[PDB]
Ligand binder design. Sequence first.
Ligand code: ZN
Ligand code: ZN
Lengths: 50, 67, 148, 151, 241, 115, 62, 82, 260
Amino acid sequence: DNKKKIIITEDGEFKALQEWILETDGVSLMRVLSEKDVDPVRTTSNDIVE
Amino acid sequence: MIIPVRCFTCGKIVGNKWEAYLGLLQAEYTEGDALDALGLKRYCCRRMLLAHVDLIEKLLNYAPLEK
Amino acid sequence: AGILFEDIFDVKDIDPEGKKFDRVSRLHCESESFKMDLILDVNIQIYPVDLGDKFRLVIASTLYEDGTLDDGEYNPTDDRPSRADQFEYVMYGKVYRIEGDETSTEAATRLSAYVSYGGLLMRLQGDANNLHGFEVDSRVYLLMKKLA
Amino acid sequence: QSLETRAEIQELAMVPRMIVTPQSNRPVMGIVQDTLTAVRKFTKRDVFLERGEVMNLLMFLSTWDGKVPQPAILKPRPLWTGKQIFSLIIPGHINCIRTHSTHPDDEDSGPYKHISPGDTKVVVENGELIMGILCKKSLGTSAGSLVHISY
Amino acid sequence: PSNKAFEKKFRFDYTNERALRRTLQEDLVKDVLSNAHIQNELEREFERMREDREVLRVIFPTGDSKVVLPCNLLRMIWNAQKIFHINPRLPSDLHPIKVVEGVKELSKKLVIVNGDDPLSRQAQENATLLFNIHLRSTLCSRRMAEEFRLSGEAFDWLLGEIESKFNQAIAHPGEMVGALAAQSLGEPATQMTKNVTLGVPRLKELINISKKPKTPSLTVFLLGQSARDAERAKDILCRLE
Amino acid sequence: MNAPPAFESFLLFEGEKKITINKDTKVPNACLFTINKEDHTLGNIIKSQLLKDPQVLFAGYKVPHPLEHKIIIRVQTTPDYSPQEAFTNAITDLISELSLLEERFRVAIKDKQEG
Amino acid sequence: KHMVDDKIHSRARGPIQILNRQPMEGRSRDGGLRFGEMERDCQIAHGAAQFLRERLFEASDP
Amino acid sequence: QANQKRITTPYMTKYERARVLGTRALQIAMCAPVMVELEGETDPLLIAMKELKARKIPIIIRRYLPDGSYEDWGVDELIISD
Amino acid sequence: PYANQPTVRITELTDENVKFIIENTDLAVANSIRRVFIAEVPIIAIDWVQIDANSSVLHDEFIAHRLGLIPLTSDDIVDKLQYSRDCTCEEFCPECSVEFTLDVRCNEDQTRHVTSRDLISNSPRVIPVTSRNEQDDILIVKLRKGQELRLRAYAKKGFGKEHAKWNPTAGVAFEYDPDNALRHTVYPKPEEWPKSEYSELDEDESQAPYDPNGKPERFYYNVESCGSLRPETIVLSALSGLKKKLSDLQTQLSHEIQSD
RNA sequence: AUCGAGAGGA
Ligand SMILES: [Zn+2]
Ligand SMILES: [Zn+2]
């Protein structure tokens, strides 16, 4: 659940959402974020310099 | 090096049984039979005799320093 | 006289889930006079019990026949008349939980008292009327005696 | 070699003051091999100590008021349980609810939640070990353990 | 808890006459039923709890209720119950408005950043926001009345103990927190040993900024249908690889 | 280098008394007996014989440290009794039991040899 | 061969080195223990400034 | 800084307590008058602890703020946590 | 409130060991008697060696220690002799020590065995046990041509609480409740355990049924002697020593009470 | 006593 999408239903509990994720072998964060149908709020990186 | 006087665990004398044990061994007795003959009922004393190596005989080969 | 609960129980099962301990066995007993339910840990090494045995349980807040509060201290050199002399198996413990089916509005129709005799647990459940004398953090005695 | 150094070491670096680490908000000390195995065996439901045994054990209790507790079994022979002695060992009126290493996952769901058939579900109330068998998960360096609650 | 669970567990009721009679004593239930100021204050308390619940939802996006806070309020409640011989089967003499004003006064007493100027006031509010939210949630009038059944003296002792414990938990000037952090981070290292670099190599890779990470990676999340269906997501994968 | 002498475990140091009587304050009619250069050999028998007494509420012994050579015996008696008297009676009874056992052992030895 | 008799060693104002007036090295030379960087580190975390001064200045090389 | 107001915490810190106890113990061991009635105590550490518990320590703590100012606190004016 | 009334029953009495059963006594008393058997029975042992000459392969410590381990006849002279601590004489005297002398030179080609027969004592009643008028003599050292041993030894009085050489027992077998009636030992699988020498049970049964109102009685003994004392003398002297220690404790207690 | 090397212990 730490990597899923956690939402709040109309009733008001936490419901994890099963959605696809993509893990890359490289780092191009600006270009990846500037892509269609890619979440720019949750997409991150593990290269601190970038 | 030499046979201890007493068993470490119980303190029974075993320092007067090495020569008799060797004689029994040369008399075709099994090691356990010799231990029973010498009245070594406890396995501590049986260890004390069965596991003993006698380095005093090897040390006696070298000549004395003082004549 | 210091007696909270007194009834005759019939043993219906003994370690129904398995003998978890060597010298202690759980008892599942039911009564007939008050229709109670009992689960008791007994030292079967010194007090052996079997299926179908019938005894009387006497839960008391004091071991003296006359009403006198107990200090909860070992005083073997005591000659005062005690009701322990009329029983075969007595255990000293404290009540650690009382549970009922009460709602936010209605009262409790049934009750369940939990006692710990130094780790030997006991749950007595049934009607709320006959368990009214039990209070949490209070010391009680078991006072069991088999009958034929 | 100096009085101020001795005083500051006493007031800061004493072992009792060093029980809980700021690294992980938990005790750094606990119960170790022999005492841990012995307390696991001692706090079992089927441990019964005779009069002489109880007195001999009480001779080794520093914070003892001198009053022998009422035995958990009075007849047909006076007997004290290990949980009673450890209850009297426990200091103050600390409250604690823990779990033993053999506690089943379905015990808290079905019946006998508060009356454990396996003597799990350690409960200490008013400094008294009401029930349960103690282990690392109750006398060790884990957060929320008995020693942590005591500190 | 859900919205319905939150309301049921934390909204003090003053319409169920029988429930109130069971919960509290006769004079207290009569006063609560009669006085409308009491009801208005309790409504405001529930509104504050709802705002705190929303703030908590914001602060913790995931439903992780585990927090590290100074005072074990549940343990102190248990200690108060044991000390004051509270009977959980009888109505209590504790007034819910006494509870509410007690929580407000205790919140005023627990200070981290002192002063009266707005900057310091907001700093103190931010510094104690989590503990105050937890304290209000635990010391709810409904909880203290129907679940904890505390008495007036028990509540007073609880407030005093909370204040003393928080003042004890406040950090001490002169503490070498830098050395503390360095040692507390270096100790695990001695015990710690697709594919992602982990352990001491990654810890070193972090401390000395590495221009060239050993295993650089991107965790890409999808926005629209792509996240649900597979064809569009593999299409995005082709677009990115 | 710091090996204690062999005879230190039983030889009394000069100026050091064999026994010492201290009174327990936590409970009434209780006393602490501290015996130097003694061990479980005397502690266990004294404790058991004190446990025989029906007017001894408590009787226990301990060795505070196996490296040290002292024992502590705690006796708590009835309000009409004294821990000193309980200790004295226990010692006297142990003396009598040992004398009886020794005489009976000598008799049995004589019978076994003489047939 | 590990006999404690060859591992015990205590120092109280013994010989000092010649390049720096600090205690010698090795029990064979009656030298003291080294209060190293990690030890000063832990004392820093403690906050025992007077003890740190005593160890590194007063008891080492005043 | 006016004595009417102070921004530091009113509680003595562990470091302040340790240093005050050590300094007062050294002063006592150097023949200073005692502010408590010594029943039978003869060791400076417990004498200083008794003085601290009596809140009769003749020492003023100069808490240096980072800005460069300082606030002077008496030992009797500080709450003792332990 | 009074003492027990114990009874003895000797099953086997030889020149090496004694077998007896003590009935109607406490476990504390039985274990104390056993402990005194081991550690609080005064016997005579060598504790002072002055090696004039030693050309053997064993060093002087080695030789002395081996000589000290040699037991000596202590049956009757142990009571007359007093500890050198309490003796008012000089370092040694006839009333607190026993003289010894060894003088062996190996001049023949055959290896010379220095046994306990070479130990010559001033006291006729204090001799090595193997030299008493079978078992051979204890080997002290072996000597080849040229090697020679010359030493003087003194035999003092002490108990096993000081050194193991003053211990007069070659094993004190102790057992109570041969059938596990009291459940002192919990056998996870009782059938795996052999019956005791004193067990009274059939082969189909492993241990006696549980006895809830029983305490340890009928303590069994097997006191093997190292030759310093006869086993009967060992038991008698241990009982007397325990009685004496209790008596000194009683005297000290009376003095302390009078001081209050 | 200094340097260097080697062998080791936790
Ligand atoms: Zn042996
Ligand atoms: Zn003499």
